[PDB]
Design an enzyme around this catalytic site. Structure first.
Site, PDB file in Angstrom:
ATOM      1  CB  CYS A   1      19.387   8.972   3.128  1.00  9.55           C
ATOM      2  SG  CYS A   1      18.152   8.595   1.831  1.00  9.55           S
TER       3      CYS A   1
ATOM      4  N   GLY B   1      11.045   0.294  -3.536  1.00  7.41           N
ATOM      5  CA  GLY B   1      12.206   0.918  -4.116  1.00  7.41           C
ATOM      6  C   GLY B   1      13.353   1.023  -3.143  1.00  7.41           C
TER       7      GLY B   1
ATOM      8  CG  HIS C   1      18.242   4.588   3.637  1.00  6.77           C
ATOM      9  ND1 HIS C   1      18.208   5.926   3.956  1.00  6.77           N
ATOM     10  CD2 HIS C   1      19.073   4.010   4.526  1.00  6.77           C
ATOM     11  CE1 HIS C   1      18.993   6.146   4.994  1.00  6.77           C
ATOM     12  NE2 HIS C   1      19.507   4.993   5.373  1.00  6.77           N
TER      13      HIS C   1
ATOM     14  CG  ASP D   1      22.092   5.867   7.708  1.00  4.75           C
ATOM     15  OD1 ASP D   1      21.997   7.033   7.244  1.00  4.75           O
ATOM     16  OD2 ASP D   1      21.146   5.066   7.706  1.00  4.75           O
TER      17      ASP D   1
HETATM   18  C1  COA Z   1       9.436   5.000   0.801  1.00  2.00           C
HETATM   19  C2  COA Z   1       8.140   5.649   0.306  1.00  2.00           C
HETATM   20  C3  COA Z   1       8.420   6.627  -0.857  1.00  2.00           C
HETATM   21  C4  COA Z   1       7.246   4.554  -0.201  1.00  2.00           C
HETATM   22  O1  COA Z   1       8.071   3.812  -1.091  1.00  2.00           O
HETATM   23  P1  COA Z   1       7.425   3.066  -2.347  1.00  2.00           P
HETATM   24  O2  COA Z   1       8.625   2.401  -3.035  1.00  2.00           O
HETATM   25  O3  COA Z   1       6.390   3.970  -2.972  1.00  2.00           O
HETATM   26  O4  COA Z   1       6.552   1.975  -1.497  1.00  2.00           O
HETATM   27  P2  COA Z   1       5.628   0.800  -2.024  1.00  2.00           P
HETATM   28  O5  COA Z   1       5.552   0.738  -3.509  1.00  2.00           O
HETATM   29  O6  COA Z   1       6.098  -0.400  -1.302  1.00  2.00           O
HETATM   30  O7  COA Z   1       4.221   1.256  -1.430  1.00  2.00           O
HETATM   31  C5  COA Z   1       3.392   0.282  -0.777  1.00  2.00           C
HETATM   32  C6  COA Z   1       1.911   0.698  -0.651  1.00  2.00           C
HETATM   33  O8  COA Z   1       1.688   1.373   0.587  1.00  2.00           O
HETATM   34  C7  COA Z   1       1.177   2.688   0.340  1.00  2.00           C
HETATM   35  N1  COA Z   1       1.945   3.656   1.163  1.00  2.00           N
HETATM   36  C8  COA Z   1       3.224   4.037   0.987  1.00  2.00           C
HETATM   37  N2  COA Z   1       3.543   4.917   1.960  1.00  2.00           N
HETATM   38  C9  COA Z   1       2.444   5.069   2.737  1.00  2.00           C
HETATM   39  C10 COA Z   1       2.173   5.820   3.851  1.00  2.00           C
HETATM   40  N3  COA Z   1       3.134   6.585   4.343  1.00  2.00           N
HETATM   41  N4  COA Z   1       0.956   5.780   4.437  1.00  2.00           N
HETATM   42  C11 COA Z   1      -0.015   4.991   3.921  1.00  2.00           C
HETATM   43  N5  COA Z   1       0.215   4.239   2.827  1.00  2.00           N
HETATM   44  C12 COA Z   1       1.436   4.273   2.229  1.00  2.00           C
HETATM   45  C13 COA Z   1       1.321   2.996  -1.142  1.00  2.00           C
HETATM   46  O9  COA Z   1       0.200   3.753  -1.582  1.00  2.00           O
HETATM   47  C14 COA Z   1       1.405   1.628  -1.766  1.00  2.00           C
HETATM   48  O10 COA Z   1       0.101   1.265  -2.207  1.00  2.00           O
HETATM   49  P3  COA Z   1      -0.162   0.174  -3.373  1.00  2.00           P
HETATM   50  O11 COA Z   1       0.362  -1.137  -2.807  1.00  2.00           O
HETATM   51  O12 COA Z   1      -1.677   0.245  -3.480  1.00  2.00           O
HETATM   52  O13 COA Z   1       0.612   0.683  -4.579  1.00  2.00           O
HETATM   53  C15 COA Z   1       7.384   6.373   1.415  1.00  2.00           C
HETATM   54  O14 COA Z   1       6.912   5.437   2.391  1.00  2.00           O
HETATM   55  C16 COA Z   1       8.305   7.378   2.030  1.00  2.00           C
HETATM   56  O15 COA Z   1       8.306   8.589   1.543  1.00  2.00           O
HETATM   57  N6  COA Z   1       9.041   7.008   3.022  1.00  2.00           N
HETATM   58  C17 COA Z   1      10.021   7.832   3.771  1.00  2.00           C
HETATM   59  C18 COA Z   1      11.365   7.104   3.738  1.00  2.00           C
HETATM   60  C19 COA Z   1      12.311   7.799   4.716  1.00  2.00           C
HETATM   61  O16 COA Z   1      11.899   8.243   5.802  1.00  2.00           O
HETATM   62  N7  COA Z   1      13.572   7.936   4.368  1.00  2.00           N
HETATM   63  C20 COA Z   1      14.540   8.609   5.251  1.00  2.00           C
HETATM   64  C21 COA Z   1      15.895   8.617   4.596  1.00  2.00           C
HETATM   65  S1  COA Z   1      15.965   9.640   3.111  1.00  2.00           S
END
Ligand code: COA
Length: 290
Positions: A68, A104, A107, A122
């Site tokens: 994104c 965080g 997006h 988007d």
């Molecule tokens: C967004 C992402 C980096 C997580 O973001 P983040 O800011 O690290 O999220 P959080 O800090 O809210 O994490 C929440 C908790 O859930 C857990 N968690 C995050 N993603 C998880 C997943 N996919 N599966 C299981 N657990 C997950 C983390 O370990 C964290 O644990 P904690 O509370 O013990 O620290 C991740 O979910 C991701 O890569 N998402 C893809 C986003 C996407 O598809 N974008 C498309 C446009 S570019």
């Protein structure tokens, strides 16, 4: 000129002069049908740069895609260049495995304003969460499109993008319960605010998404591309094609497991991606759905 190069890369013929919704929509449609959502650089020892010039060279000159923070930043530049009132906005992605939104601002999305009217634009949502036309910023209004019905809702000054998806018919018995499939018909996509951003506001998250052990992009090789009828998505070795609204208000989804040797050919012929280094595809853990 760079703008003509960009329009050539997306196959768009800027012949109408007009800065209207039809033009905005045509450019969005062209980009999402040409420029794949992809993170393959992360799986062949190459950079995920946030700089516009580096993104332009990668996408426009080397016929690649991006995530994104890249594809929407390129679209921001194109739309701004031709004269649309365009703003970068920051969103927080829904994380289905934990039923929560990201902490965080991971997006990047756009808002385009045309004679006072506001549209959310988007080109980098990924796979079957991808809008085909801009969404008007009207809380509670159904916005049916070919992919699904999109819903923007406002609560407590925060804006939420959701979709209502069709039933899914899976043609490969072996993938009927794939962790690649969205489970619910009603899916949260992301939330955001109307606070204007600059690209520097995403620098910390650009690094985070490449380094944090929580980032699904590190453990999943992913590419998606829209077509006029559907969506191609390759997640590791698993190639999927989805035909929207195949029959009886149901989507049709095909799955095929590729060999290492077949990945390169699929990337070339479906996605128009050629990589300059060796790719190590990774299946993921169902965090990134088709
Ligand atoms: C967004 C992402 C980096 C997580 O973001 P983040 O800011 O690290 O999220 P959080 O800090 O809210 O994490 C929440 C908790 O859930 C857990 N968690 C995050 N993603 C998880 C997943 N996919 N599966 C299981 N657990 C997950 C983390 O370990 C964290 O644990 P904690 O509370 O013990 O620290 C991740 O979910 C991701 O890569 N998402 C893809 C986003 C996407 O598809 N974008 C498309 C446009 S570019």
């Amino acid at each position: 000129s760079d703008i003509e190069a960009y329009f050539e890369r997306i196959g768009y013929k800027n012949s109408r002069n007009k800065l209207d919704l039809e033009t905005l929509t045509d450019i969005l449609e062209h980009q999402i049908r040409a420029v794949p959502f992809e993170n393959l650089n992360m799986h062949c020892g190459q950079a995920m740069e946030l700089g516009l010039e580096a993104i332009f060279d990668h996408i426009v000159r080397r016929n690649r895609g991006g995530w994104c923070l890249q594809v929407n930043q390129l679209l921001y530049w194109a739309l701004t260049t031709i004269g649309f009132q365009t703003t970068m906005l920051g969103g927080y992605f829904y994380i289905p495995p934990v039923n929560k939104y990201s902490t965080g601002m991971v997006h990047l999305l756009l808002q385009v304003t045309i004679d006072g009217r506001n549209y959310i634009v988007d080109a980098g949502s990924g796979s079957s969460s991808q809008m085909w036309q801009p969404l008007e910023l009207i809380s509670g209004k159904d916005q049916p499109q070919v992919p699904c019905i999109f819903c923007l809702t406002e609560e407590r000054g925060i804006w939420y993008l959701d979709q209502i998806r069709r039933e899914q018919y899976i043609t490969n018995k072996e993938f009927l319960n794939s962790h690649l499939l969205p489970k619910k018909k009603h899916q949260k996509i992301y939330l955001f605010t109307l606070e204007p951003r600059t690209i520097e506001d995403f620098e910390s998250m650009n690094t985070y998404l490449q380094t944090s052990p929580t980032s699904s992009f590190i453990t999943t090789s992913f590419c998606s591309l829209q077509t006029p009828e559907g969506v191609y998505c390759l997640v590791g070795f698993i190639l999927t094609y989805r035909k929207f609204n195949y029959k009886d208000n149901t989507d049709l989804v095909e799955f095929k497991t590729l060999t290492e040797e077949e990945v390169e050919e699929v990337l070339k012929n479906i996605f128009k991606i050629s990589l300059g280094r060796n790719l190590v595809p990774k299946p993921g853990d169902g965090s990134l759905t088709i």
